[PDB]
Design a protein around this nucleic acid. Structure first.
Ligand SMILES: Nc1ncnc2c1ncn2[C@H]1C[C@H](O)[C@@H](COP(=O)(O)OP(=O)(O)OP(=O)(O)O)O1
Ligand SMILES: *[C@@H]1O[C@@H]2Oc3cc(OC)c4c5c(c(=O)oc4c3[C@@H]2[C@H]1O)C(=O)CC5
Ligand SMILES: [Ca+2]
Ligand SMILES: [Ca+2]
Ligand SMILES: [Ca+2]
Length: 342
DNA sequence: TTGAATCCTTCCCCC
DNA sequence: GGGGGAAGGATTC
């Protein structure tokens, strides 16, 4: 059948910052995103392994991080820079197979199904690829390999960082039963829970309960997806993918409800969203408001034509008003999202 | 306590 | 009964 090759750049942002300034290597680096809310307000985009060893990881606020390693190198996030370093590594990959996916800013699956006869040769192509990526861009990555996407990724998760691992059918059969279901791609702790108090603690357990029970607890989708992984029938193609929407949000200095106070933030958001749009014309626009208590509320509108920057501002203001109206909390975060491209 | 981008489920129109 | 689609909330990486 087929063999999937998953490539995953190690502690990426942090690493890219290390590449752009080698003096950093071997020292704990925490790449964070600072919100003008107050000094050191914000969170950790991510951190390299030195820093991570001690708990400073992605998601923890910057203040807690400095309390753990008050002496680590803290750098602001430079997405653009990372975006270009990624694009570069992404191309090198295309050279190994035109069947590439690119799931995120540091992930990509490759159907080397043809370019390889056996796993032995896959493992080889893995090193070939790790090495060529290390030579051209100075970036270390983990590579996973198996019969399908989901497993090619799991193989990687197991081998981080700067690793390479092949999961053969026997490794799969073993995993379908001994692999914790919370560690399966697509299962956030939210679904990991509903599955926990349902008896499904292992990828296999999904076979025991009747289907229409799962469909109601976690949804027809996740239901069928899980079942196939368990009966070893899962086999999704490595399809190239196109961005289906762009957007931008911004935290405000103070939380408020004053339309006029929020407007400037909204527009700042819209303005950047267009730059990103580049040459794309969106037919749908949505305004997203993160309430003072971190709950998300969004209103939107789809037009039968493209959205001009001018109209964009206009329709955005209405949609925010509609939010303040329909809600009551103070707005903490505001922004826009443009979808349904022409 | 920082974004971004893609699903899950109502719901309204109408053959 | 169900094709076709827009809205807002849910969930994941
Ligand atoms: N919780 C988060 N908050 C903000 N940015 C995040 C978060 N998680 C991930 N990111 C961004 C920062 C990273 O550079 C990139 C994600 O990297 P991730 O691929 O999942 O693994 P990584 O290789 O950088 O980490 P790892 O140390 O596990 O290998 O996406
Ligand atoms: C939205 O607001 C916060 O910003 C981010 C950014 C992430 O990745 C770039 C992110 C991830 C995860 C998560 O639970 O939260 C975030 C958040 C916060 C969200 O609440 C993951 O599991 C992977 C990335
Ligand atoms: Ca990674
Ligand atoms: Ca990744
Ligand atoms: Ca998980």
């Amino acid at each position: 059948h087929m063999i999937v090759l998953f490539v995953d750049f190690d502690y990426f942002y942090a690493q890219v910052e290390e590449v752009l300034n080698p003096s950093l290597k071997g020292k704990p680096v925490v790449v964070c995103v600072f919100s003008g809310r107050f000094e050191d307000s914000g969170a950790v985009a991510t951190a390299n392994y030195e820093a991570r060893k001690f708990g400073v990881k992605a998601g923890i606020p910057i203040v807690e991080a400095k309390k753990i390693l008050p002496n680590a190198v803290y750098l602001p996030m430079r997405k653009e820079v990372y975006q270009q370093v990624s694009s570069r590594i992404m191309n090198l990959l295309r050279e190994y197979s035109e069947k590439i996916e690119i799931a995120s800013i540091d992930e990509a699956y490759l159907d080397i199904s043809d370019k390889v006869r056996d796993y032995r040769e896959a493992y080889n192509l893995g090193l070939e690829i790790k090495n060529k990526i290390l030579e051209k861009e100075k970036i270390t990555v983990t590579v996973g390999i198996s019969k399908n996407k989901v497993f090619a990724k799991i193989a990687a998760d197991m081998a981080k960082p700067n690793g390479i691992k092949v999961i053969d059918d026997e490794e799969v059969k073993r995993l379908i039963r001994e692999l914790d279901i919370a560690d399966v791609p697509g299962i956030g702790n939210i679904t990991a829970e509903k599955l926990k108090k349902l008896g499904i603690n292992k990828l296999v357990d999904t076979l025991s309960i009747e289907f229409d029970k799962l469909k109601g607890m976690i949804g027809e989708a996740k239901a069928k997806y899980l079942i196939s992984l368990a009966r070893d029938e899962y086999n999704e193609p490595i399809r190239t993918r196109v961005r289906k929407s762009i957007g931008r949000i911004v935290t405000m200095k103070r939380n408020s409800r004053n339309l006029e106070e929020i407007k400037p933030y909204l527009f700042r958001a819209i303005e950047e969203s267009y730059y990103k749009l580049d040459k794309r014309i969106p037919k749908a626009i949505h305004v997203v408001a993160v309430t003072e208590d971190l709950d998300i509320v969004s209103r939107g509108r789809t037009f039968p034509h493209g959205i001009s920057k001018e109209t964009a501002y206009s329709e955005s203001v209405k949609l925010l008003q509609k939010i303040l109206e329909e809600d009551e909390r103070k707005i903490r975060r505001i922004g826009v999202r443009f979808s349904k491209f022409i």
